[PDB]
């Protein structure tokens, strides 16, 4: 899967960088109270999934 | 060395350990934003 | 008259000194003065 394990990983990196900035801003703008709470839920679940995906793919490139 | 699969991330790994001190610095950026109230 | 917020100017000023200092510490390991 080589090139696509590296794509899962940079997906994870990218998503982390977005979550790092976005989660605190989301949490402190209670203007976007509800609009945004759905997004972090998605982001969080997608993050956990990318970690799992990268963890199994590791045992096909290590 | 990292496993070769991860080697492209070597430069990122090189700088990660300094991140905790940026938090301490961030606290001061933040207090300046609120005028050290 | 105050158009630019002080906290912004402080952070930018601050990060500018970090870089110059950082460079000076890089230089202790390279070129003149590195023992090499």
């Amino acid at each position: 899967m080589t090139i696509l394990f590296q794509l899962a990983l940079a997906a994870l990196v990218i998503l982390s960088f977005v979550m790092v900035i976005g989660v605190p801003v989301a949490y402190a703008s209670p203007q976007d109270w509800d609009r945004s709470k759905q997004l972090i839920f998605l982001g969080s679940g997608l993050w956990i999934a990318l970690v799992l995906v990268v963890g199994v793919l590791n045992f096909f490139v290590v | 060395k990292l496993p070769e699969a991860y080697a492209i991330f070597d430069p990122l790994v090189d700088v990660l350990p300094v991140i905790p001190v940026l938090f301490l610095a961030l606290a001061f950026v933040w207090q300046a934003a609120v005028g050290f109230r | 008259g105050g158009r630019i917020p002080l906290w912004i100017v402080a952070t930018v000023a601050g990060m500018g000194v970090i870089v110059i200092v950082g460079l000076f510490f890089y230089g202790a390991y390279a070129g003149l003065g590195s023992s090499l």
Binding site: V25, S29 | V15, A25, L26, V29, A33 | -
Partner: peptide, 30 residues
């Protein structure tokens, strides 16, 4: 190289002040 290191730490470093900046624009709860 050292480019990638410095480009990395440039991006990480900007991340902190951005958060503060964004919350100040959006008149958030600093």
């Amino acid at each position: 190289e050292v480019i990638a290191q410095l480009t990395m730490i440039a991006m990480i470093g900007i991340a902190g002040p951005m958060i503060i900046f964004l919350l100040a624009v959006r008149r958030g709860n600093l």
